[PDB]
Design a protein around this nucleic acid. Sequence first.
RNA 1: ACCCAGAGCUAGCUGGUUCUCCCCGAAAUGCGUUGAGGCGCAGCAGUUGACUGGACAUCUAGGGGUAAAGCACUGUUUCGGUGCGGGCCGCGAGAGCGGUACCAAAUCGAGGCAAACUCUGAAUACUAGAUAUGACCUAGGGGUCAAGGUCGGCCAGUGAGACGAUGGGGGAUAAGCUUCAUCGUCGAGAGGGAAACAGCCCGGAUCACCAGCUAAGGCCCCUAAAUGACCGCUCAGUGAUAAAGGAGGUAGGGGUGCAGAGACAGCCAGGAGGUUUGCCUAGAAGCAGCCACCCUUGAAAGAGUGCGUAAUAGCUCACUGAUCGAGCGCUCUUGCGCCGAAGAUGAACGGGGCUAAGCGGUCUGCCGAAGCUGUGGGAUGUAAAAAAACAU
RNA 2: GACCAGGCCCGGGCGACUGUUUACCAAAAACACAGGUCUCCGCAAAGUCGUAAGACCAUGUAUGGGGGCUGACGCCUGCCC
RNA 3: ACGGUCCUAAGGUAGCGAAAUUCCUUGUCGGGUAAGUUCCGACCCGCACGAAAGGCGUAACGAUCUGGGCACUGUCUCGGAGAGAGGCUCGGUGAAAUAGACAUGUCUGUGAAGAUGCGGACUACCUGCACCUGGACAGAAAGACCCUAUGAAGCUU
RNA 4: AGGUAGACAGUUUCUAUGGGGCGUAGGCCUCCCAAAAGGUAACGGAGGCGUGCAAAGGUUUCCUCGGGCCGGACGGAGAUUGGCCCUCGAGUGCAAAGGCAGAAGGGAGCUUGACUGCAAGACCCACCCGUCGAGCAGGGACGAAAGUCGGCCUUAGUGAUCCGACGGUGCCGAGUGGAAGGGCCGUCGCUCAACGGAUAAAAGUUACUCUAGGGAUAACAGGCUGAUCUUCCCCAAGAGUUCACAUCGACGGGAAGGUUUGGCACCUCGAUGUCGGCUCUUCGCCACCUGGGGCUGUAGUAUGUUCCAAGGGUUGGGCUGUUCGCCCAUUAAAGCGGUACGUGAGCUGGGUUCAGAACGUCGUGAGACAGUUCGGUCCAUAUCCGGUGUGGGCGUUAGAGC
RNA 5: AUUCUGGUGUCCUAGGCGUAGAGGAACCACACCAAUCCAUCCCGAACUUGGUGGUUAAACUCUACUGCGGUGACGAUACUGUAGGGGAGGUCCUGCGGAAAAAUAGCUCGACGCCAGGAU
Lengths: 108, 47, 135
Amino acid sequence: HKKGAGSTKNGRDSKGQRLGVKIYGDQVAKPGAIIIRQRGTKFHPGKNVGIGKDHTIFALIDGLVKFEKYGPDKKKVSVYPREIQPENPNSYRARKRENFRLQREKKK
Amino acid sequence: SSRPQKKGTAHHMKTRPKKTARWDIKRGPAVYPPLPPLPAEWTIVSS
Amino acid sequence: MLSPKRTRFRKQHRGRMKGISYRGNRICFGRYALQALEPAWITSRQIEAGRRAMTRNARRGGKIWVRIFPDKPVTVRPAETRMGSGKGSPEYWVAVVKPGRILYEISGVAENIARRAVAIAASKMPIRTQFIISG
RNA sequence: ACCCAGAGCUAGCUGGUUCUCCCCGAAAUGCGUUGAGGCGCAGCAGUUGACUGGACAUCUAGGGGUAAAGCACUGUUUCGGUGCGGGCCGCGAGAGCGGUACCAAAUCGAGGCAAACUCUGAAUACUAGAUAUGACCUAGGGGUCAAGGUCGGCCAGUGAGACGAUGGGGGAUAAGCUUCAUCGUCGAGAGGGAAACAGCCCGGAUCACCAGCUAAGGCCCCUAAAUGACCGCUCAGUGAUAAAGGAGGUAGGGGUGCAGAGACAGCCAGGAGGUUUGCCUAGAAGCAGCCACCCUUGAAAGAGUGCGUAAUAGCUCACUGAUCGAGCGCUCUUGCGCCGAAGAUGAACGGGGCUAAGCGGUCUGCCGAAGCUGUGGGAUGUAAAAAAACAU
RNA sequence: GACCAGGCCCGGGCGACUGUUUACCAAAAACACAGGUCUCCGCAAAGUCGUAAGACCAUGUAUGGGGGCUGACGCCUGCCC
RNA sequence: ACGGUCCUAAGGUAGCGAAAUUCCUUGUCGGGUAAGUUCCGACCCGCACGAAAGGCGUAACGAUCUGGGCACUGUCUCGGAGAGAGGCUCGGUGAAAUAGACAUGUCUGUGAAGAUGCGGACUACCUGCACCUGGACAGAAAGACCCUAUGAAGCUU
RNA sequence: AGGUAGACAGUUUCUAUGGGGCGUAGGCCUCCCAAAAGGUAACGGAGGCGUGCAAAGGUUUCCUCGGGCCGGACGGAGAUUGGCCCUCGAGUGCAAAGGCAGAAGGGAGCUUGACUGCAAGACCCACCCGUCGAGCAGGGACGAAAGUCGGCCUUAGUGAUCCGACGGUGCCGAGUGGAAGGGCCGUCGCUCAACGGAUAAAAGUUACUCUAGGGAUAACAGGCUGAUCUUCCCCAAGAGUUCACAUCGACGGGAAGGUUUGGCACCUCGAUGUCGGCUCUUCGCCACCUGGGGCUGUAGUAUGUUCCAAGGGUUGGGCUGUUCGCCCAUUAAAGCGGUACGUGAGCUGGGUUCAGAACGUCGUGAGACAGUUCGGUCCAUAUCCGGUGUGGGCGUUAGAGC
RNA sequence: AUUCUGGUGUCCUAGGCGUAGAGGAACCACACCAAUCCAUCCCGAACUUGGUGGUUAAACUCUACUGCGGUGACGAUACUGUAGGGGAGGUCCUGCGGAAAAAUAGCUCGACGCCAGGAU
């Protein structure tokens, strides 16, 4: 009734190395910000963009990230600064942060 | 046999009382005409 | 015993049997066919035993075809043994059949006899099958 | 050995740790550990400073390879057609070769499968940016409140989790089994429904009222409320408890075969000569197994669906006349029932009991919680103090 | 004639035998035993106990003294350094 | 019995052998009994006897183990009767372990999965004394098994 | 001063674990599980690493592989040489995944950036650690130049701290000058592999044992589960002279039961006594006999099969601790189960869990072995419920005896 | 301002092949020779140098067809966010919201920018 249990020859792994897209498409970046840790060139380097020893793709300039279409079934990544970025005190966020600030000041 | 049976909260899952009949699920409270305005309760005028 | 020939990997998962079988609905060879309704894990012993019993009632002529081939393995662990300590060896191979799938096809006998035959072949199997004529 | 002393030895171990009210309120996870029932740091509490704006809601943009689907790749696979190459036999026995009851590469056509396959590719989720004024005052002014994070100081517990839903793994797609992922409840949560019943359903207990409305669930009596209504269904005590299979039980629907030039079921009728038929000559003779599955005589008959024989003989059923005189025969589909259904102190739907007081569908009343409403009282916080609210 | 006062036989295992032993669960097949063998020791002996002095051995000296194993008696006791 | 070949320091001689050794196993054969998993003798497939941790025999001896017979009987078939010492009743003296509180039924259901206490039924005047032990997971000893503690202590190389 | 006795002493002798032990594993990299961000467990499924290269690096220029088909000496399915056709299925030092076209793949020329001084900024996270890096400074490489180079197509090839060691260096140097000794920069010394490393240095046994704890954790019992067991049923190939269905029923399918052997670890470790026997029960039916039936391949007798039925009954011995089993003599028959494998505050103690002793075996040894043998202390005055008996009170409506 | 040929991109298979035709006035390519510059792991095949006497055949450029290749709906269906329900048999059903892949209709034989040179 009490038979022996056979050992395995498995049970080894490496904890997920945390690759993938760090800075997404149409998003803020920096000079030096790592955009993608990819194991090979899944995405390819575009304009304004360095490519490192590990095929790590990082931005050289400010601006928003762009994942372009390369030609025959591949992907690029370029970075573009943005011209004018308007802010209106009309809006809800602007209204509410000024309301909050004014409450803070009013209390103390 | 090989029909494992319902026990613990698994009994309570199965045999809970529940309506599950479209007409009985609707219904809700009964509607009425609200009411004309009523007077105070205990007006004073004294001492 | 319709066993697969040297597959990729030894042991594999159970998954489950959601959905209706869409593809193996059509009939190719036969004019009459046995079709499944409930999903099950059909061993090769059940297939072979259905095929034999269906063949026995062909008699004078008319050809029979099988349209389900097991592929998936199943392991029972070493009998009377505690939990854990790896998987077991695969005992037998099974066909994952879903609802509305062809199991056996047959052509070239009188509709009298085919229907009689598939009753036996239904009786050998673990599921509520049904008879279907189309081709 | 005992006695005294070091000595209140140490004990990550067990037990125990005493008055009251108010405010907030966890965790049972990750990481490391001579560590696994301990400890450290993170995560999640309290408290007190600093920095700002989010939160919930809707709408865009991003990269995904999962469910799905597919066979172009990687494997796997069945059948057919083309068929290199292989199996076996035949020759004037060392040059030479031809047959071939035959297994079959590779492509083509049809047809499947795949956690570790993808020419494809959802929903959610994740990241980012956008837009919207939550409750109380005469479309704003000025008001009152509630409403989320980041950083840091001081100072905790936790680090045994459990069940349920889903996605999976292990197991025997056994376990009130085990292990992860996302969420609910318990844990730390009273009350009502579930007979009793942590974990299911409803709902979050500041306190008082011999007021009211309702949620979940119910309205024959035990025991609050309809022995309410109208239309269907069951005949089983089903209504409490399980399958393969069995079936002129009963009710409805559609489709399908004949039928007062008369069907169906009963009822005396007919149901033939070569057929000892060729066949392995022991016999298969309408009926072991073979094929052929004749055509005549005809109101009709198959060289035969079954019984009966060593084989014949013989008995039927197919069909057709005749008697007879009105709706009947064979499938499909459901709805609700029956059998299948057998255990050990004694009945077990909660009990009585019920032909509805059960099931299905619809319509309206009512009951029903510590939920909400009303009427009063307390304490917090919004500042400091009182009144005044708003929230708690 | 009361009290008092052997039951006997046949076959096997283990140990020869009387003996000793777990006070308060074990009395035996366990220990001891006569007998056997090996090895040490020449006397200021080996051995033992002591820091030492010295004590036992022994007021004995190889037919004696210490230690290992076996266990009357009979027949035996092989191969391997 | 007879040979071939490998390894090893060497491959068990005499004797004994299913035994205080024997797993398979109640080995098989014969004896003993109406019937014998124990017993006696033989076989040898000695899992894993063996020559001074001696081998094999042996008259005697044993509160030794283990089989069989005769005699004997309440050991038993299968109980029965009687005598004492208690038990029982009366008077005198007078403990104990135990004890959350106890107004302390049966059935089935429920629940930390085995209920006098929770649900439904059933049964049941209140209270002594004699007898009986099924339950109170009855009492007794912070399990002596099992595992844990970077516990303790003996003993070994 | 060197050797040399567990004779004697102090210690050490890991953790995980679907109870422990026996095994297996312990660090790092790739894939899956993983649920289309990342992350993610199991004694889940699959493999690798503990390097290699002076060029397989750097740069400058040049090249397009692999597999088939057809022709061609030896030469064939395949070496070399030409043409054709899909074109990236090849290769990429080494496992996998992601990548790589005139390429990151293959060849050649020249060389050493496999360099010093750094570094805005991000990723990854408990900490320790790890990773990418625009650009500047110097001094070079290669090219005509623009430019590219601080190792490798990328992800494994690795260990902290203390300490010591070698090369560099007025930085200190205990009165002051030196020196001894430190510091500073560059570097070397771990299968510290139990790989976040307790020490420079450590194994066993206890049935002679003890303490602190645990139902967080096994053995007995219950519970869940029902794989195995027990009992039924569907199918029907076939056996039965003929005929599946008198009697059996292959290949297969579906159930119940909770008596076996398991799985789980939910109550109980501040104790619920483990087998068998005696005594005394009771209950279930899946019926051994006794009552009453259908079918029979039922002439009768005697059966076989199966339906109803659980009222009653279901011997005495030999052997074994045994339940079980075999055998002798019987008999209407010698049923099978539940009740903590009924019943130890009712009994027994033969078996099994203490200390002694022995045999075989394993162990260098102490000791060990569901291997064997002989010997080995079984408590209790009944509070309550419950039972068998038997009184007393009261009740029963005025009180009594029959 | 428009259209060609030669160079450069955006845009990458609605843009690629096949089939059929057409272009040498220019531009572009094939044929002549090679002391030398320079070269062949051999060879002026290629690189390079010097010349021109042929040609639109190959390539390249341009116009057509859908034969392939490619792209590809609507509708449904699978699947799934969320709120419920049925089954003990292991999955199914409903409301509310999102919505494939495949298949087919059909769509495609490029578009568009700048510069150099030629022509109207």
